[PDB]
Every structure is written in C-alpha cells, then in structure tokens.
C-alpha cells in the first residue's frame, strides 16, 4: 500500500489522503494515530463506514485501485498520523507507511502479558475483552515497531474456526480465543529483536476480519526482545 509521507492544510480546509493498492479488488480502513505510543482509532473502515462516535467531517470513498480518507473542515484536533489498511490476495490485513498530516496556522480491550524476553523465547499476551458480545466478532493482533508503522500480526473468526498471520511470524504465531472468558490469546515463539514493539488488540466490525475492516483497539502491551 502506498500513501502519501505528508499532507497539510489549514484549519477549514478539505484534506484528502489516498492509498493506493495492488489491484482494486479490496477496500479501506483509515486508522488515526496522534502520537507513536498511543492507540489507533478507527475514522473510517470498509471504505466508506463511519463509527457513530467519529465527526461527520471524515468520509472515505474508493476509485479503481485507490482508496481516498476526506477531511471536509479539518480541525486542529485531527492532526495525527493516519495509516490505511487493506488486505491482498496473499495476506489478510496490510497496510500503508502512514500519512502524517500537519494542520496549519494553529467497546474496551485490555492487554497484558508484555515484558522483556531474550531472543529464542516466547510470548503469551492476552487481552480481556468487555462491552459487547465477544464470541460474535472476529478479533486479531497489529503490532509497531519504534518508529515504524502498523503491521499486522494474527487474526481469528469469531468462533475460531479460521486464524491468519502477518509474513513476518507465521509459522511462530499462533492465536486462539476464550469465548467463556471473554478473552483473545497470542502465542508468539521463538522471538527475535525485530519483535520488539507495542501490542494492540483489535476487534474487527462484524464483516469479517481485513486489515481495511477494524472498529476497535485497545491501549497496546509493549515487547521488548534482547
């Protein structure tokens, strides 16, 4: 996925941030980041739905091989780095290097389990869920490396049929959910220092889980590897 580095406007203005993937045959999901150590939050997702709690100024629309994140009235407070995802033929949920756009002229998920581990070891994080009914969305595990963007890590259906992983751990994930306990589980073994990062939990909206499709993240554990 290829979006832009930068983009800037003044307080008022339309802003418009494009994505553009490998083929037009998936869509988009626009996930807000105001600072590196803090939780995404979901804008826009399946190209054009907006959650009921976000401000009708951010729509989103798709054209061809390219989904577009509209700002119309951009305020001070949307200043943050926006990343797309999406999905592709090989992999369920991709995303873009983010866009950090500069304004001018100025449902809980719980994670645990981070920690320092040595290389070769393995991870447990679990995240308690709360809020809604949680045997009845799909849920996954995105991760951040410092100074780098979103990555996608495992992704389960709702009642844990089917998982999938991001390139760089599959075959050393593995994720499974509890949905007595309200709770989602990754096991991530054999570790290595490109692991390092922070943690998120994600839940997808009810249509399946895609990088371009999730409505929730909680505040992320960090992982140290060394």
């Known amino acids: 996925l290829t979006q832009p580095s930068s983009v800037s406007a003044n307080p008022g203005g339309t802003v418009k941030i494009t994505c553009s993937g490998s083929?037009?045959?998936?869509?988009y999901g626009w996930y807000q980041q105001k600072s590196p150590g803090s939780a995404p939050v979901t804008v826009i997702?399946?190209?054009?739905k907006r959650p009921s709690n976000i401000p009708s100024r951010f729509s989103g629309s798709k054209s061809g091989s390219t989904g577009t994140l509209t700002i119309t009235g951009v305020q001070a407070e949307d200043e943050a780095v926006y990343f797309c995802?999406?999905?592709?033929?090989?992999?369920?949920?991709?995303f873009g290097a983010g866009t950090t756009l500069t304004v001018l002229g100025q449902v809980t998920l719980d994670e645990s389990g981070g920690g320092l581990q040595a290389p070769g070891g393995a991870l447990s994080l679990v995240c308690k869920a709360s809020?809604?009914?949680?045997?009845?969305?799909?849920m996954g595990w995105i991760r951040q490396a410092p100074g780098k963007g979103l990555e996608y890590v495992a992704g389960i259906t709702d009642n844990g049929r089917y998982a999938s992983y991001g390139s760089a751990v599959d075959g050393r994930a593995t994720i499974s959910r509890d949905n007595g306990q309200s709770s989602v589980r990754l096991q991530l073994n054999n570790l290595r220092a490109e692991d390092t990062g922070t943690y998120y939990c994600?839940?997808?909206?009810?249509?399946?889980?895609?990088?371009?499709?999730?409505?929730?993240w909680g505040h992320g554990t960090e992982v140290i590897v060394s």
């Open positions: 997702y399946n190209n054009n």
């Open positions: 994600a839940r997808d909206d009810g249509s399946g889980w895609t990088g371009n499709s999730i409505d929730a």
């Open positions: 083929s037009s045959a998936y869509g």
């Open positions: 809020g809604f009914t949680f045997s009845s969305y799909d």
């Open positions: 995802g999406s999905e592709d033929s090989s992999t369920d949920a991709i």
